[PDB]
Ligand binder design. Structure first.
Ligand code: PLP
Ligand code: PLP
Ligand code: PLP
Ligand code: PLP
Lengths: 447, 447, 444, 449
């Protein structure tokens, strides 16, 4: 109506602010189920699921009803020292129940994934102080890992584009190579050998720093924004092994994988591993209300709550920690996740979608490989297949392919040289077929 | 009603996690207007306004309706590179218009005040890189300043309790003394002389660090969680001037003071000052939906959007940046702020409340002074009025006084040695009188 | 010497044409130095606060030659040593038994000695089971060398501007400088109270459990000869103890008598936990530095658990035999000739004899000192104490004219610094007063 | 007599050793040195197989150097070199060094008293170079695993061996470590020099891309890594280091504290690989240990930028009281005369090759000797528990020290660092002395291997 031509007074995250690029906009006006409609009336399948978070689809009546009911009762009250409200009790019980297998004991709520990560990092340090080991302060993380954009989360991030414009951040953060078969420093194409390489490097890094100086390691069970990097099956079991050997806390960044996208209620659980700390957001409310959560296992909960002196004071949290309306939405969302077995649907429909996309590798030289697990999938676009040289996004080919997919009726997300598929976990087989058709059309014209 | 006895599976921010303290809970079930009700049916005036944020009162029909309407249209969609939706256009236009006097040009939305600060700090760094001065990296802030609990915000915080349990954070953050008449290093009780002292210290710190290494200074127009410290009237003008003398960006943390609590739509505007960056949250949605906002003036917008190479890429933001439902709530909330002149009501009723509390200084030895501006007020409790020695919060006397106020029907917040009053800005004179009576009863019993 | 200069002068502009000029010193004897043209001047700066016994002492030269004949150098790393390092370590721990000094870690200069103090301070807390103790406190205008650690805790900006971000967790306090301080307080006891309260507030802000050490000069040298109130160091010691913080006394300048006592800290009646020594320890004849640790620190590390008892810090030239032999001879002279006492007596005479300059010349704001470290603080306005700007060059012009009058003095910022050998006689003190009177008469 | 030094209480600490009792009670007390032999307080003589600490490169007790020292003490033992003041010897030595390193276009020297100083000076002045150049964002440092660069906080921050870090907490931020091109132990298990180089260079490129070249000030490396275990890089590694640095404008700092002045067979290790760095760090052999001296040299590129720096950026506010020490400079001039007159770089190359060849049979004869590597007269015996797993001996079990102890009784003092026995004798070593080192080591492994 007026959004096509007006000057833009906000900035898009993860994009150029330069004109004329900044003048261009795709304005989404409504969402229903797994389809979204722009201001011109053009409808498209939500192949990006909002931002890997609208996992139950748009406009679920039961979630809207839960929100409205809580607004009528208590939209907001704080949860600071000694004060709380029913919904934060309800959700904390629910989450610790859902993750009893991992022995999760306490939750610290927030409003997003960057919050949940920042919380894990800060509280990991407090765990060690409360335990009498204040020298345990350094953090380990993986190349291509993405953990939000707070200064702590950014410090442990493994992609340079998020660093270049912000100077020196947290010291004592150390990066390990990721077990990425398609691109790794050893050109190692054997998953088991690659795991062995990464674990040896990890041990050598720990030996170099001294285990007694390392607080925690943080990693995504499947690395999302870094390019949907699916680790070898034995990597996470060995991550847990190394952490146990040296007492280091294992932080699973489950912001994307939490609540079913990779085929299991937790990505780490999918690999047969129990972390010490869980970071959750995105799918926890399916995007309806901002919410994040950091969960701590009994080991951590007991140490902090029994800390001497000031070490048991938890001087960290947010005005909106435990927001009643966000909690009410999460409770309704999680009911749907479990009721409709969306982790199982993601595993099944995701496996089909991955298989049906493999012909693209054959047919188009620019498609280096297609990888995924559940309903997170990446098309890794390269200029030639020997060195795996990524296309440069500034040349615009990934965006043009995406544009053509949108014209074919499916919205997908280009991140760097990769096309990311992360649709709602309610995706059906027919809708998966529509995604394949739109993508084949896009590469046919712009590949 | 298992909320009374069940094990608590969440942690309270800003409180002891040790048993038996953590077993105690005040469970708030409902809220309407300026009153809240616990699970036992006990009503109390919300003297803390949630957490300085329920500024229009609880349970406003028009805000609830705006939320429901947006949920029916589009609960959520992203705003990353090239994608947006109607509501974020609407609110960005609204905010830049409200703050046209301050030449605000661009908004980067988030979900809270800690986000808004963290965004300010990171984008301040990027401004200087885009401007060709990547040596500009250090941050200045004030003792007793509070700027959230992300690692960046924590690094510039001016109260030790938020640092003790989390190790070394951001380097290059330097604290200045706050122009606090009641407690300052000069024992200076003249506002004009105190300002001069602080400005001299600031100049000396800049000279020591080198202006060319300093990115920005961040400050609250009235310091909230630090104890409602109202600066001399001429401090913020001089603060603005020294920053400009050296090109340093002035970040106004308006998370509490933004939208009227101190008597003006902006605290900085109330002092006659235009910052380069504004941080907003809390009152922006009156707590109904999590939302934060960081606003940048034309100076900053022009530099970044014209930056060379990668410096115009804004690789910072959050999944819920620009959340449609949060934006819809904000639009409805701001209509009420402006329609009902809540900044004006805060100025008038707050001044009344402040004068009505002064007799407490007379009557009770523990009350060192009572200060405030608008509807943020602090009772500064001391063991000795000559040295102004603060009571120890861990000894519990502030909490015991607060407990008695609750029994009298008014919930107030002890932060350290101070009792904080921060009720909704719709507070009436009658309700202010009720607050005075409850506090008189509390000190009579526990003072 | 009209050739291109292939070395850089520390603490100066490297730009041409400034860099083309040089005062080339060829000879030194007693308290005088002579350039290549025979231009002769009293060494009013004592080299760099270090030629404390004068130039060309036969007994020191002989001690050096004797050690060169026996063993010029051998290492002292794990399990290996040599006679001289035994001798000097015994000598120093004996001289500083009052302070309960137990172990020495030698080096080659003051920056080394500071850097060693900082690193070993960190190790003390790790060995003690408090590895969260990492932050360092220091004073504005403090100078602690130019290694990255020493620079990080320095309190003068000119040493930071060109080197970017260094060590994190270093926090500066205001210095108890009577002539210029944030309280405009010229009363020793009141200024002390102001500074101590500030110190307490910063510790509360950081948390004692995160702070490794505080480092300070008993008299701040390069910062402008700032003599603290008499009760400052006692209360400094007490606040540090209140919180367990290690007190590092940077005695690189004050060590071995310049301020009137064998240690500046001892002169204030204080025992630090760590001593940093250099400059005067060898009177400049051979590079040497020393860091001494009290029984508290030595015992904790030697009983440390795990790896905390491994001292993986030190220098190839730690314990250098020839440097140690030189120090033993130098220290013999310090004690034999009671040079701390001479610095006290003659320094007081010089200080009193300079006071008329304050009255006589508007540019001389004040003259302060203790022993034989003295500063003339030059100002454009005595009401505000506005310092002259050195970039306008008046301090250098005054210094130049002092040189023509036969005395070399050092302009640092707006201050003229006097730090001559501790063998200074009453006549030579008078010569310094005279040369300065001549300089201000023309260039003041 | 030296009797009073036996059993006497030690009031000093040994660097790089346990301070715990009873270990600290043991001491080998050296009483005198002559040529390449040292004598302990019991009268036992041994070849100085460690050359002091890779620094007594011309031998002990050189009359001409002692005379040069005594002569300068009589003339001017010390005077400062700060702003506008200097003395003849610092002119002499600066000219000498810039002349010796004209091939590398070295233009300015900033003197100090040791290798840690020289590294620290390089790091700080690298920072100043970029600020003077208008690029104050260039602040990060790159270095190699197993690299050793002294023990100041800067040098320690870029060090690549954990034992020097464990006890000192967090130091300089923005320091990043790369794997070293170490044939015997590397993440690729690659024993092919060209292939290992390619692996390391690609890792370096990836690290630069991740950080952003515009944030990186300098890379520092040893032409042969000394204390890390005498790791001789592939021949094409340093040429490719220079390439990558040039690709991104990064300053190349050659830590020549050990290799400077001939130990690896060339007056500079970097020159030995055919490379010109931007900054040279020198110490140890520059005075052969007679007087502490270090030097950091800067090429014309750096010198011009700083001397033309705008605002305050041309002020060099870094240096040491003993920078340019007249007596140290006089000693250096006499030492360097000997280095060139006796062609000690050539002797190190020739005798070093002989010694290295003669030691290879030990690999076959003794299971604990994993390999013997070296270049010139820096050589390491890399001790392992068995050649199948290549597991390094753990020094805390004490076998490397026991082997060293046996070598000492056989008449040669050698250095155990971790699992490695280091040989670094004076560069005046003769063929007979090389043979003595082989025999003493043969005896040591026969008894304790
Ligand atoms: C998206 C994401 C985050 C950040 O979540 P926000 O809500 O955008 O702050 C953190 N970690 C991972 C793995 C993510 O995908
Ligand atoms: C409350 C507050 C914040 C943090 O806001 P959150 O929503 O709790 O993250 C930041 N700055 C100030 C001045 C605040 O009062
Ligand atoms: C001169 C000085 C130093 C540095 O000594 P150098 O030998 O120049 O490295 C350190 N601290 C103080 C107080 C000094 O005066
Ligand atoms: C020995 C060494 C140093 C340190 O030299 P010192 O004189 O001990 O300070 C620095 N770098 C390297 C490569 C060294 O071998």
């Amino acid at each position: 109506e007026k959004y096509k031509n007006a000057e833009k007074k906000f900035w898009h995250p993860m994009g150029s602010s330069a004109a004329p690029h900044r003048d261009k906009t795709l304005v989404i006006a409504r969402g229903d189920g797994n389809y979204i409609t722009d201001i011109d009336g053009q409808r498209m399948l939500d192949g990006v699921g909002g931002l890997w978070n609208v996992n139950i689809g748009h406009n679920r009546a039961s979630v809207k009803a839960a929100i409205a009911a809580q607004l009528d009762e208590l939209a907001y009250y704080q949860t600071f020292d000694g004060i709380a409200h029913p919904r934060v009790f309800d959700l904390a019980e629910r989450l610790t129940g859902m993750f009893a297998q991992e022995r999760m004991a306490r939750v610290l709520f927030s409003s997003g994934g960057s919050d949940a990560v920042e919380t894990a990092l800060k509280m990991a340090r407090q765990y060690w102080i409360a335990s009498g080991e204040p020298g345990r302060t350094r953090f380990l993380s993986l190349r291509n890992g993405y953990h939000g954009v707070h200064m702590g989360g950014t410090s442990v991030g493994g992609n340079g584009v998020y660093h270049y414009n912000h100077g020196q951040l947290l010291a004592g953060c150390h990066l390990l190579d990721t077990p990425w078969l398609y691109r790794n420093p050893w050109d190692c194409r054997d998953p088991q050998a690659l795991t062995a390489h990464c674990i040896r490097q990890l041990e050598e890094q720990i030996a170099l720093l001294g285990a007694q100086t390392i607080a925690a390691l943080i990693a995504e069970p499947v690395q999302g924004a870094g390019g949907v990097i699916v680790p070898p099956a034995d990597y996470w079991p060995r991550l847990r092994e190394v952490c146990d050997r040296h007492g280091i806390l294992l932080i699973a960044d489950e912001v994307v994988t939490g609540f079913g996208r990779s085929g299991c209620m937790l990505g780490s659980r999918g690999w047969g591993v129990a972390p010490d700390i869980l970071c959750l957001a995105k799918g926890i409310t399916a995007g309806y209300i901002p919410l994040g959560a950091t969960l701590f296992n009994q080991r951590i909960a007991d140490a902090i709550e029994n800390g001497q002196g000031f070490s048991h004071m938890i001087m960290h949290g947010y005005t909106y920690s435990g927001h009643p309306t966000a909690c009410a939405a999460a409770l309704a969302v999680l009911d749907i996740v479990e009721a409709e077995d969306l982790p199982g649907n993601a595993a099944k429909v995701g496996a089909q979608l991955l298989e049906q996309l493999q012909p693209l590798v054959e047919r188009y030289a620019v498609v280096g490989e297609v990888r995924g697990k559940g309903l997170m999938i990446a098309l890794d676009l390269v200029s030639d297949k020997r060195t795996r040289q990524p296309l440069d996004p500034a040349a615009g080919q990934p965006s043009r392919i995406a544009d053509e997919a949108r014209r074919a009726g499916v919205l997908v997300r280009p991140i760097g040289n990769k096309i990311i598929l992360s649709p709602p976990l309610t995706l059906t087989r027919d809708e998966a077929g529509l995604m394949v058709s739109a993508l084949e059309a896009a590469f046919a014209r712009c590949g």
